[PDB]
Design a binder for this molecule. Structure first.
Ligand code: ATE
Ligand code: ATE
Lengths: 232, 232
């Protein structure tokens, strides 16, 4: 219950990593041939026509986010300290979770749209790309729930690090060493939140976050085929 | 009593709800239709000053139509109605305007329109003033309020007995408290979702920061070339 020098230094390293590779991420989507209507924020009756371009765009931004995210982790000495296998296994399992956690950063609660650069994503756009409604609703509830907590870079990065060092993921060997990492990550998350008692005013913030981390994992386990198909 | 909050709710929804979806009706410069755009202060100003003037008028009219459906209000000396409105109108406008504010992008989404501070800046308004306005809207928005706490907050400001020109600052400093604590109570009747520490105090702390800017800055809210037929 209080952050020591080691911990404060860790937060900074995380933030640094996040800021270089993920923060600038969302503003690069426009480079991946986005369909014209994506540039409009207000389009109640606008048609979308062909799926291919829209579809391959989502394909584009998804690969780019997963790439940057990999870089993100790669900039963490703690992560590098693990075995090749374990890393590939942790990323292979936490990339989607870090993605929506990072993406919530551009999410607007008032309009339930993500503002990435000059682009404006709406749930209906994913619908038009063939994503399952139930999937999309869950993904949406998550983002609404998480935005309502009024988080900031620090809380976002810590949370992401918490999801990264999860041992329960298949293919891991150093299960107990890594589980130690996650616990140190959560304790820093928790204590960090307290340090900001005045800013963060939702009750049971920590639990609510870890709770949402649970919801996220469930959603992927359930509609995993939606993503596996996108990746091909 | 809690039925007075049904009177307020129906008043607001009828004349102030669709208030914002009509701004598109008053010759808004094409750029207000875009959410992502360059700041060009060397651009034409007059057409934008004209717009803000037309919608400032329009808004005032609906806020009048609003208060004109509050029995507790009409049942007062016309010399006070005018007086109270002479200073509340503005304050309400911003409380009601806040429902179109997105905390993420800091824009105001009114119908197909997207208003930015940059716009008030170009219109020629002064920093500090705008700064207060933005600060007000960021703070208030961060409290996750819904209609009930809006119409409510608004009405307690509607009856502010310490306003210049009021006749019976006796029956007014009564009608207000006859709702100030009715606001504090409702806040608890929903203590679950409204979990901001010390809402009320923070709320009234906002009603006070609105008045202070309603004053210090007023000479400019006036300027708003009040000529329509002036163009053919
Ligand atoms: C398509 C994408 C982005 C690429 C891929 O991660 C899958 C997700 C599913 C969920 C999508 C999101 C883009 C932005 C969307 C459209 C907004 C709500 C649902 C969102
Ligand atoms: C112009 C107006 C509306 C009329 C008048 O109350 C002054 C204010 C100042 C502040 C303005 C607002 C319109 C909408 C704006 C442009 C959005 C942010 C700043 C906002």
């Amino acid at each position: 219950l209080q952050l020591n020098q080691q911990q404060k230094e860790l937060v900074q390293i995380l933030l640094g990593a996040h800021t270089r590779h993920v923060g600038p991420l969302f503003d690069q989507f426009v480079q991946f041939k986005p369909p014209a209507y994506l540039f409009m924020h207000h389009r109640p009756f606008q048609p979308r026509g062909p799926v291919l371009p829209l579809l391959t765009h989502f394909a584009d931004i998804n690969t780019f986010m997963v790439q940057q995210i990999i870089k993100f982790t790669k900039d963490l000495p703690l992560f590098r300290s693990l075995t090749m296998e374990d890393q590939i296994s942790l990323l292979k399992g936490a990339a989607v979770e870090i993605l929506h956690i990072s993406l919530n950063t551009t999410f607007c609660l008032q309009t339930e749209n993500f503002f990435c650069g000059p682009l404006c994503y709406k749930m209906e756009d994913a619908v038009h790309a063939g994503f399952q409604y139930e999937f999309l609703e869950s993904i949406l509830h998550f983002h609404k729930n998480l935005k309502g907590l009024h988080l900031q870079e620090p809380e976002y990065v810590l949370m992401a690090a918490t999801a990264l060092f999860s041992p329960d993921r298949p293919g891991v060997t150093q299960r107990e060493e890594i589980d130690q990492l996650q616990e140190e990550m959560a304790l820093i998350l928790n204590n960090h939140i307290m340090e900001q008692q005045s800013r963060l005013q939702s009750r049971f913030l920590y639990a609510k976050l870890m709770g949402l981390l649970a919801d996220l994992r469930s959603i992927n386990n359930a509609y995993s085929y939606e993503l596996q198909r996108l990746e091909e």
